[PDB]
Design a binder for this molecule. Structure first.
Ligand SMILES: CNC[C@H](O)c1ccc(O)c(O)c1
Lengths: 60, 338, 211, 256
């Protein structure tokens, strides 16, 4: 009854003591990552049919 | 005093919220406003794997990018080969009420479990014959909703007794227990670094756990109903959830807020599964309206659709090298959408 | 070879489907003090029961121990032949432990509504058992039925106020044309077999369009 | 009137092909209709698809051309072929009827014996029986041997008609005592159009044909009217035997 309530306050007291960065710095890093790696994702930019194992290639 | 516990808790709740508001600078609809649209993705089912004679509840790729596994109410767990549609193995399940699968990063064994309250580990290379049952992980008091391999010698599992637990196979004992949820835990997702993981519960909240401490770092709310699915962003600094509220959302670990919401006005059913492409530019989500929409994670616009199933889509996965998407459903059919 | 693999294994799946789809599967429900304990004897997680009667396979699954939310696993059980719902009649003057002022009689009428009028069991029949009629008469000759039912004005007896309770449990049914409730007073392994052949007959008779 | 006598028959060919092929694709493109008893609708559809494409055209030529037959050796491969197709569409209707009679009386006992091992045995048994009776200036006249006309009428209509009325009035007793759910009118109009259609289409031909064998006379105007009634029943079979089932209607929308 009271032991749990003591633990609950302790968890929040430790959750609200973290350093946070702004969202604008947070959205930029997500956007920058996808631009750099956009070249290596076949689904977004379709791959030549020579190497697309399920489409037409060596099934091995 | 009970009031002192409540008064301290109530004050800390307001302090957390205001710190989140101080971090609000600009939504993603502004920073990513002048970005180029993806366009209109158009995938087509290359393969189609037949052989399950009942619903399909779960699947999982391999690190090979060529072998997968599936589970069904037929009490059968099949290891296919996607190139040639071959059954590499098939495993008889001691229980028919499976809800999850797994595939070791080494790829020498698989994991399974269901309403049994136990998690079975079968060996995919016995050096002398077929597959055996080389472990047993009991210690949950509710149905198993999820399990994941942390390494060749660890596994982390989720259950409906409101608890996630980190085991250490070859001994069959819980090294750590992760408590704090107040509802049935539905899903978990490891980090690429394999030092953190997130979970989703029917309490309509999610949490972030440090693996090697048993500690909970921070909690995320905002959904209005049960959370069914969860997935990390490819670099491990964000994750997305899908609820029965008919909406997906995106959460940042280092901003502690909701970033984007992916919902339309013609969608009233619940999301059963989410996943991210290899680059992280697309988000794929299965629904109860028999379909699987594709979203533009950086713009929150539909960018495709995978409509090829007769019943609701229950499971969904993507390959490490990013070549194919697999979807399963209550039709007993699983499709590869290269 | 990945061509002589599937053929030598898919020949082991269809060989198991039709080989294991002939059994009759059922689903037990009830409450803690219902009678689920004292009906299985006569006939963790999910429990399974297997028994035979005149060359028909029965597979009864008990889901009592699962104390998690029900809506998150009940959809796994659609497609069973019937539900088997247990009630105890000697609980019309018994109050729950956790919460007072609520009987264990009005608490079973809240689990009959949920399963009878459900979206996953819109065409599945219910087999309702009413247990502990032995002790029911003893309590009704001393403790009047008014204590539970303030609208059951009628002479108390063994089978006058114990048939007023069937009505309160069959009125809860709202699908009065798609399903039927087969009520019993626990010939207990016969009532299920009598009522199962009547559910299979009306299924085949519906493949012909006559129902 | 070559305009009516060709356009009308061409309509028969279209409906028979449209209905039967649509049934075959629907059975093979769904898992709801994956039951082993639904291979009767397929085999019956193949018996009624060959009669439309092969029997009706050649027979149509004889009536409208008026004079003779182009050939003298295909008659034994046509006049016999026609009998076999007609005989195998009625004979598949007793197998459908008998299937749903054991499912309603011996329900639990009949949960087995439903394997395609038995189903395939029946269909192979249905087509061989049809084969036995089919192949035991000049024009084409259907056989007029007194020992074959009355032998093949009993073995093709009058015997299969004695196993669809006994079955469908025993099934009338079961469904009246069993349901008792105020659904009396439902299962009496379904058993009246299954039997009525089959009898009004086929009875006059096999009735007048037998009279012209014992030594009576029948007008040739009526006999040709009755002759083409049997071809009509081939088109109607997909309608009567698949419309009262909800499962077939759902699968039909899957393709249309
Ligand atoms: C109108 N076409 C039916 C054909 O003339 C026919 C069919 C079955 C038979 O047994 C037969 O002797 C003749």
């Amino acid at each position: 009854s009271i032991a749990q309530a003591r633990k609950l306050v302790e968890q929040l007291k430790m959750e609200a003591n973290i350093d946070r960065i702004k969202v604008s710095k947070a959205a930029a890093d997500l956007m920058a990552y996808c631009e750099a790696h956009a070249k290596e994702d076949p689904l977004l930019t379709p791959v030549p049919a020579s190497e697309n194992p399920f489409r037409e290639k060596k099934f091995f | 005093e009970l009031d002192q516990l409540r008064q301290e808790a109530e004050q800390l709740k307001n302090q957390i919220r205001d710190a989140r508001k101080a971090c609000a600078d600009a939504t993603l609809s502004q920073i990513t406003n002048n970005i180029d649209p993806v366009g209109r993705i158009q995938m087509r089912t290359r393969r189609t794997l037949r052989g399950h004679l009942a619903k399909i509840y779960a699947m999982h790729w391999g690190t090979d990018s060529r072998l997968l596994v599936s589970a069904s109410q037929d009490g059968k767990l099949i290891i296919w080969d996607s190139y040639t549609t071959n059954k590499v193995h098939a495993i008889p399940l001691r229980s028919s009420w499976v809800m999850t699968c797994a595939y070791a990063p080494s790829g020498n064994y698989v994991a399974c479990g269901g309403l049994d309250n136990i998690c079975s580990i079968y060996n995919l290379k016995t050096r002398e014959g077929n597959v055996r049952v080389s472990r047993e992980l009991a210690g949950h008091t509710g149905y198993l909703s999820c399990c994941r391999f942390l390494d060749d010698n660890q596994i982390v599992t989720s259950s409906g007794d409101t608890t996630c637990a980190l085991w250490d196979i070859e001994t069959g004992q819980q090294t750590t227990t992760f408590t704090g949820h107040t509802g049935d835990v539905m899903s978990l997702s490891l980090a690429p670094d394999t030092r953190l993981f997130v979970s989703g519960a029917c309490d309509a909240s999610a949490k972030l756990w440090d693996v090697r401490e048993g500690m909970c770092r921070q909690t995320f709310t905002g959904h209005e109903s049960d959370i069914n699915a969860i997935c990390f962003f490819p670099n491990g600094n964000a994750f997305a959830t899908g609820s029965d509220d008919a909406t997906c959302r995106l959460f940042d670990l280092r901003a502690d807020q909701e970033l984007m919401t992916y919902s339309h006005d013609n969608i009233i059913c619940g999301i059963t599964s989410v996943s991210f492409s290899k680059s992280g530019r697309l988000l794929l989500a299965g629904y109860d309206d028999f379909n699987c929409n594709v979203w533009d994670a950086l713009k929150a616009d539909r960018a495709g659709v995978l409509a090829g199933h007769d019943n609701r889509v229950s499971c969904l996965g993507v390959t490490d090298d990013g070549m194919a998407v697999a979807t399963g459903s209550w039709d007993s059919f699983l499709k590869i959408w290269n | 070879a990945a061509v002589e693999r599937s053929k030598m294994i898919d020949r082991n799946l269809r060989e198991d489907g039709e080989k294991a789809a002939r059994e009759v599967k059922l689903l037990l429900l009830g409450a803690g003090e219902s009678g689920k304990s004292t009906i299985v004897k006569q006939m963790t997680g999910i429990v399974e029961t297997h028994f035979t009667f005149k060359d028909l396979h029965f597979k009864m699954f008990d889901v009592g121990a699962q104390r998690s939310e029900r809506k998150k696993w009940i959809h796994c059980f659609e497609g069973v032949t019937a539900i088997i719902f247990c009630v105890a009649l000697s609980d019309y003057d018994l109050v729950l432990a956790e919460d007072e002022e609520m009987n264990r009689m009005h608490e079973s009428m809240k689990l009959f509504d949920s399963i009878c009028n459900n979206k996953w069991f819109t065409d599945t029949s219910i087999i309702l058992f009413l247990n502990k009629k032995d002790l029911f008469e003893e309590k009704i000759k001393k403790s009047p039925l008014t204590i539970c039912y303030p609208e059951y004005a009628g002479s108390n007896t063994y089978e006058e106020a114990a048939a007023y309770i069937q009505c309160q449990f069959e009125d809860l049914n709202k699908r009065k044309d798609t399903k039927e409730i087969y009520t019993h007073f626990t010939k207990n392994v016969q009532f299920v077999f009598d009522a199962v052949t009547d559910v299979i007959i009306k299924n085949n008779l519906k493949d012909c369009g006559l129902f | 009137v070559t305009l009516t006598l060709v356009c009308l028959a061409g309509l028969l060919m279209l409906l028979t092909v449209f209905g039967n092929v649509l049934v075959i694709i629907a059975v093979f493109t769904s898992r709801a209709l994956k039951a082993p008893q639904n291979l009767f609708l397929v085999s019956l559809a193949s018996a009624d698809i060959l009669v439309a494409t092969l029997v009706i055209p050649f027979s149509l030529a004889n009536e409208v051309m008026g004079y003779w037959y182009f050939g003298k050796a295909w008659c034994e491969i046509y006049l016999a072929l026609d009998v076999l197709f007609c005989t195998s569409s009625i004979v598949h209707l007793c197998a459908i009827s008998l299937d749903r009679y054991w499912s309603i009386t011996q329900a639990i006992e009949y949960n087995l014996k439903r394997t395609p091992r038995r189903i395939k045995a029946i269909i192979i048994t249905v087509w061989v029986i049809s084969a036995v009776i089919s192949f035991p200036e000049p024009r084409c006249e259907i056989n007029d041997q007194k020992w074959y006309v009355i032998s093949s009428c009993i073995g093709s209509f009058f015997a299969p008609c004695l196993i669809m009325i006994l079955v469908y009035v025993r099934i009338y007793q079961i469904a009246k005592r069993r349901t008792r759910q105020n659904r009396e009118k439902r299962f009496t109009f379904v058993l009246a159009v299954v039997i009525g259609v089959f009898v009004v289409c086929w009875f006059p031909f096999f009735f007048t044909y037998t009279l012209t064998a014992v030594g009576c006379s029948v007008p040739r105007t009526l006999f040709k009217f009755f002759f083409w009634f049997g071809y009509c029943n081939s088109s109607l079979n997909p309608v009567i035997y698949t419309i009262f089932n909800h499962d077939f209607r759902r699968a039909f929308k899957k393709i249309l």
